[PDB]
């Protein structure tokens, strides 16, 4: 299937407590593989996935140097936005960026992206064309014209279809044993009594990878997605994910309901009933 390389960067100021905290987290799908934290005892880019041990010392040296340049750059960014927005130097503010690319199973670029956010709201973003920008407000409009005159879109575009896609292939190659695997989910249902002759049925799905999965409760062959309660798929701390979906049914009629689980690791969807 398709794969992606994503980088989540966050810069947050803390007036009166020193420099802003700067962080970088990279993902090669749903698995964290690298990260940088300015709050570390000795800030440096470090592996977060075992297959990243395949990269030479130079890799970590280059990524660390770049991350450090980025930190200074974002420190200035926060100051700049204070002026764009005419804000006080005493409040904490946040800048968020997400950039990456996606490729099909053949490795060809499917899509590239880069969007900024200020204080939790959209700021500026690269359009799908990978040639122009879209500013959410007049502040982001100042940045748009700045990047336009500096030919930043060309630079970004070259990275997205260039370095981004190529290094994504290499990561998928080196960590194929990890990134290209499939862990079939293991499910089970729990039963909880309710004050009203009502029963709560919860379907649990664990130990699976990738993270994409579908859990839907049935009754008379009709999906009850409308009366379903769930939680977003979440990391289980070992590289796998888990999720659960529940439905409240009348006590005594729990046998008429079934939980259906779909996932790449399930040749045939799972069907569970209390």
């Amino acid at each position: 299937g398709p794969h992606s390389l994503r980088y989540f960067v966050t810069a947050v100021s803390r007036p009166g407590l020193g420099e802003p905290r700067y962080m970088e987290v990279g993902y090669v799908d749903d698995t964290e593989f690298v990260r940088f934290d300015s709050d570390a005892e000795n800030p440096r880019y470090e592996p977060r996935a075992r297959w990243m041990e395949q990269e030479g010392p130079e890799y970590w040296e280059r990524e660390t140097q770049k991350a450090k340049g980025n930190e200074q750059s974002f420190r200035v960014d926060l100051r700049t936005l204070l002026g764009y927005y005419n804000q006080s130097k005493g409040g904490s503010h946040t800048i968020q960026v997400i950039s990456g690319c996606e490729v099909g199973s053949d490795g060809r670029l499917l899509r590239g992206y880069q969007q900024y956010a200020y204080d939790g709201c959209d700021y500026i973003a690269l359009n799908e064309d990978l040639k122009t920008w879209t500013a959410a407000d007049m502040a982001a409009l100042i940045t748009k014209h700045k990047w336009e005159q500096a030919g930043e879109a060309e630079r970004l575009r070259a990275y997205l279809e260039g370095t981004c896609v190529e290094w994504l292939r290499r990561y998928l190659k080196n960590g194929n044993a990890t990134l290209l695997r499939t862990d079939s989910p293991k499910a089970h249902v729990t039963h909880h009594s309710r004050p009203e002759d009502k029963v709560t049925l919860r379907c649990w799905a664990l130990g699976f990878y990738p993270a994409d999965i579908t859990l839907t409760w049935q009754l008379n062959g009709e999906e009850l997605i409308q009366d379903m309660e769930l939680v977003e798929t979440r990391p289980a701390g070992d590289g796998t994910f888990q999720k659960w979906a529940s439905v409240v049914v009348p006590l005594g009629k729990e046998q008429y309901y079934t939980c259906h689980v779909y996932h790449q690791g399930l040749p045939e969807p799972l069907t569970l009933r209390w």
Partner: peptide
């Protein structure tokens, strides 16, 4: 491989 971001 991460990107070297541009100033706002």
């Amino acid at each position: 491989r991460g990107y070297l971001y541009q100033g706002l």
